[PDB]
Write a protein that binds this ligand. Structure first.
Ligand SMILES: C[S@@+](CC[C@H](N)C(=O)[O-])C[C@H]1O[C@@H](n2cnc3c(N)ncnc32)[C@H](O)[C@@H]1O
Length: 259
């Protein structure tokens, strides 16, 4: 049994109160109030982000974990935070996002932030049945949380295969969401993939304690087992002490105008 599995079991054990306190205990988050109001009022300008993903991607890009450039593909773009953020980047030439949409799934949000004319968000698309196309920047943010470690593992495996098909055309720069990296077979296959392709695993502090997600990014050089187990250690530790306060970071402003 790995530390992440113990984390998972302990998480399932927790009460509603304890969970409510734990999910955000000590994490970093973004004040999305004004962005929510503006977006609800139909303000396409102002530079507001459509989701929190922008803040996540930002956190990585401003640390060299990846450097977006050229043709960008956003797999499971949802509302499209990653797509717009990437579209605000100089080296980036084209952004193509794809999400599932429909009931229960996010639809893209039409906003005119900076570089909105180079964005192209396509809903009603299941990337598992989609043919890969050559690109320079491979983004993927797929991985739905489940109470079952086995389910999360299987979902992660399917995702990793699907993105394997895309990485085979060989970017470049890439950011791939890994929901469940805390099981043995997962660390094994992630080691394997980290041999075949490059990159490493990074735990974004914007991620809530309720999820063990780490992002497999290109510009990172790390050991799988070590990074994962340290992440597990942290998420475990936050389940014992008092409630650590949240570090309220500022929301990202993507400005306006075209490119
Ligand atoms: C966690 S959200 C991330 C959204 C985006 N990264 C952002 O920053 O706003 C993942 C989205 O991917 C979509 N999705 C999940 N599986 C998909 C699939 N197989 N094909 C296309 N989209 C999918 C879901 O609808 C979900 O809204």
């Amino acid at each position: 049994e790995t530390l992440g599995e113990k984390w998972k079991a302990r998480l399932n054990q927790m009460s509603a109160l304890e969970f409510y306190s734990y999910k955000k205990s000590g994490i970093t988050e973004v004040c999305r109030e004004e962005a929510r109001r503006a977006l609800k009022d139909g303000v396409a300008t102002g530079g507001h982000a459509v989701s929190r993903g922008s803040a996540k991607l930002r956190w990585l890009v401003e640390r060299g974990y990846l450097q977006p450039y050229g043709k960008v593909i956003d797999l499971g773009c949802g509302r499209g935070g990653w797509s717009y953020y990437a579209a605000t980047i100089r080296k980036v030439q084209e952004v193509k996002g794809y999400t599932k949409g429909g009931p229960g799934h996010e639809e893209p949000v039409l906003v005119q932030s900076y570089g909105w004319n180079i964005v192209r968000l396509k809903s009603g698309v299941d990337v598992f049945h989609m043919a890969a196309e050559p690109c320079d920047t491979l983004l993927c943010d797929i991985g739905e949380s489940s109470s079952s470690p086995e389910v999360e593992e299987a979902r992660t495996l399917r995702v990793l295969s699907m993105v394997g098909d895309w990485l085979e055309k060989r970017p470049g720069a890439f950011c791939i969401k890994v929901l469940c990296p805390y099981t043995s077979t997962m660390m094994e296959t992630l080691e394997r993939l980290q041999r075949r392709y490059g990159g490493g695993l990074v735990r974004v502090p914007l991620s809530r304690n309720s999820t063990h997600e780490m992002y497999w990014v290109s510009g990172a050089k790390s050991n799988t087992i070590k990074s994962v187990s340290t992440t597990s250690q942290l998420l475990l530790g936050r389940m014992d002490g008092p409630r650590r306060p949240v570090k309220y970071e500022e929301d990202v402003n993507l400005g306006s105008g075209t490119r």
